[PDB]
Amino acid sequence: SALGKLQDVVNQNAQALNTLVKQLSSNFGAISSVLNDILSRLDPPEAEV
């Protein structure tokens, strides 16, 4: 645990990247988080929302 700040910065960057990746599994009020599944299930006029 000698090099503390370097490991802290690396861990912060890794956590930021992991959060940015995991923010794609959210619906945000939509039907699902899969854009291809939405496009295959709903027509564009109804899937625009």
Partner: protein
């Protein structure tokens, strides 16, 4: 049956086509929720009811 005693029908282990029902011109209302009236003959479901 009646409205309070509706009969649930389980459908599984089969191939179901829906284009013959939408184009039948006999059903008054054919409102689809969550899915579209088209592009449904290219999808596969796990357990549907009727």
């Amino acid at each position: 049956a009646s409205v309070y005693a509706w009969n649930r029908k389980r459908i599984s282990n089969c191939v179901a086509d829906y284009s013959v029902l939408y184009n039948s011109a006999s059903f008054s209302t054919f409102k689809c929720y969550g899915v579209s009236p088209t592009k449904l003959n290219d999808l596969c479901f796990t357990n549907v009811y009727a």
